[PDB]
């Protein structure tokens, strides 16, 4: 599975995710502002953080 891995508004990039069936996109706000993290797999849902997990290549833009 190939997943996007760039942060926030950075130019889109990809990495391979061996042994993963999911890609994730995590969005949250802190003192720095709104942060968007993308990568392999799918972490558990936490209040305050908006999480999107998907199953196809580069689905997490």
From Swiss-Prot:
The keyword Membrane does not apply. It is found in: Secreted. Expressed by the venom gland. Disulfide bonds join 3-23, 17-40, 42-53, 54-59. The keyword Secreted applies. One of its GO terms (cellular component) is extracellular region. GO terms for molecular function: acetylcholine receptor inhibitor activity; ion channel regulator activity; toxin activity. The lineage of its organism: Eukaryota, Metazoa, Chordata, Craniata, Vertebrata. Keywords: Acetylcholine receptor inhibiting toxin, Disulfide bond, Ion channel impairing toxin, Neurotoxin, Postsynaptic neurotoxin, Secreted, Toxin. It comes from Naja pallida. It comes from the Eukaryota. Belongs to the three-finger toxin family. Short-chain subfamily. Type I alpha-neurotoxin sub-subfamily. Binds with high affinity to muscular nicotinic acetylcholine receptors (nAChRs) (tested on Torpedo marmorata AChR, Kd=0.07 nM) and with low affinity to neuronal alpha-7/CHRNA7 nAChRs (tested on chimeric receptor, Kd=3 uM) and inhibit acetylcholine from binding to the receptor, thereby impairing neuromuscular transmission. Produces peripheral paralysis by blocking neuromuscular transmission at the postsynaptic site. InterPro entries: Snake_3FTx, Snake_toxin-like_sf, Snake_toxin_con_site, Toxin_cobra-type. This is Short neurotoxin 1.
